[PDB]
């Protein structure tokens, strides 16, 4: 599998979440929970060039 973190904001202090499987992320991201998108980024490695969930293609991973 492949988990994907998600941050509501784009700051270095903002809340850091998204330790769920791409499957769980796709649900929330697809369900519509994020109407504006979130700072999505693979958990490992920790801390990288984050990317908006709306700019990622989970379909090319699951």
């Amino acid at each position: 599998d492949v988990m994907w973190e998600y941050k509501w904001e784009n700051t270095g202090d903002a809340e850091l979440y998204g330790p769920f499987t791409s499957a769980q992320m796709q649900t929330w991201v697809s369900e519509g929970y994020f109407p504006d998108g979130v700072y999505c980024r693979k958990l490992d490695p920790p801390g990288g060039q984050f990317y908006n969930s709306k700019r990622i293609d989970f379909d090319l991973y699951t």
Binding site: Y6, W8, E15, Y17, G18, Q24, W28, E31, Y33
Partner: peptide, 11 residues
Amino acid sequence: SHRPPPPGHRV
């Protein structure tokens, strides 16, 4: 199928 509320939120 269903799922719980994601972290962070704001209420």
